Each structure stands twice: as structure tokens, then as C-alpha cells.
Nucleic acid binder design. Sequence first.
DNA 1: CTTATAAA
DNA 2: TTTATAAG
Length: 247
Amino acid sequence: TWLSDFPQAWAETGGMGLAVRQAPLIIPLKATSTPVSIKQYPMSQEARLGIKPHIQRLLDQGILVPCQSPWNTPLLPVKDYRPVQDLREVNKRVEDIHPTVPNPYNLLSGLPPSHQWYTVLDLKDAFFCLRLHPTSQPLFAFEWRDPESGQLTWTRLPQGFKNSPTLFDEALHRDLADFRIQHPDLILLQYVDDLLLAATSELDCQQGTRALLQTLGNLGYRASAKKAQICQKQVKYLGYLLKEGQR
DNA sequence: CTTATAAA
DNA sequence: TTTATAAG
């Protein structure tokens, strides 16, 4: 089984990821920025009870930690509840970086007709695999209370932060550089957390996929076994249907 | 909820 | 000028 053969590589069996080779990220501020503390709009009990289990899981996982910070941004009061942080005022104060993630159209142009056997993997909770340096953690604080009050913040690259997709894409590229060198006859397309591996034959695709899963797992990333498309001549990738070299 | 942009 | 849409 693809599952049993690579327990470490799958989110379902390997536990929450952590990119062990990647240094905790420091997030540079713009030259003139100072902290902004935005009050939390009062949240209804219904919303709070909805969000609570997610917050607790993240705390248990060490992805959230208590803190006291001069920064504060709101969680959405209406957000099937899940916590969404409005990081816009933080984003405005963070120094911009060059956008290096290719658009899907251009990314797909690197797929040759010679390689028509596909594996598509998506990494689960990808941003959370990247640690934030403790110096940058306070930037992302928000308020949490459970009547029956303090701030929490993220110890990993957060959702809603303007640079997360680019920083993740760049980190995974660094981590997969050797894989590319070891497998010169495979095509690997990276779009943040969405990966396409393409091979000349079913066999090469099988061996390539084994090697990619082993590598991802070893590095601390986790792919979704449920959504995995393995060694197919027809796959869905980035909203396209990849079929016989078309699209 | 707030806010940026677009469409009406 | 208002309304709608989208997104953190």
C-alpha cells in the first residue's frame, strides 16, 4: 500500500509536520513600522464555542502559545466555525518581498509531452510546517478568552500573512533541490503546497513517487493521502485536467 | 466584522 | 452615491 509503505509521508499517519531543515523565519518590518493593537470585536458564544476546539488543538500542538504582545489583530466573529485572523494591519507593516511563485499557467508550460504519467500531492497544513523565529512571533498575536483573558500567538508561519505562500514555496524549493538533482529525468512542479511529479513511464512514476514521499516525510512535510493522485495518466492539478499532455 | 475595489 | 463583491 502507498499508505503503509510511507507512514511518515502522509498527514493521516505521520503526525503534524515540521520542516526540520528550515531555520525559524525572521519577518522583517518596514523601516517605519511600529506595533498596532487592534481591539477584538466581541465574539458571540456560538462563534467562540465553534472556534474553541481548533484553538485547543493548536495549543496542544504547540502551534499556538500564550504571549503578551504590543501587536494584536482580530479573529473574525462570524468566520462550521474555524478561526480566521485579519492580518491586514500587520501585512501593511511588513517589508515586501519579491513574488517568486509562478502563476499556474507559466508553471504548467514546463510540462513536456514526453512525461505523461502523473502523481499529484498536496501538503497538509503546509505553512504550519515552517517555524517562526521567536522574535517574529509577537507580530501575529490575537486575543483569546474562555470565561468558564489573554493573547495567543503563532509559532509557525500563519494563515492570512501576505508572505506565507512565497516563503513556503521558497522553503520547499530549498528542501527539494537535492531530490531534483537525484532524479534528473523526473519533472517536478511546485505551486506552494500543490505538487505535480511527471514521468516518462508508469514504472518511473512509481519509483519517483516513492522517492518523493520518502523525501517529503524525512524533511518533515506531510501529504494528504485522501486526496493523493498516484501514478495516473489523468490528474487534476491547479484546476486543470491533465490528460494526454493537454492543458 | 472590517475594508478594498468594482459595479450598479 | 449606493450597492455588491471579495477577502483577511
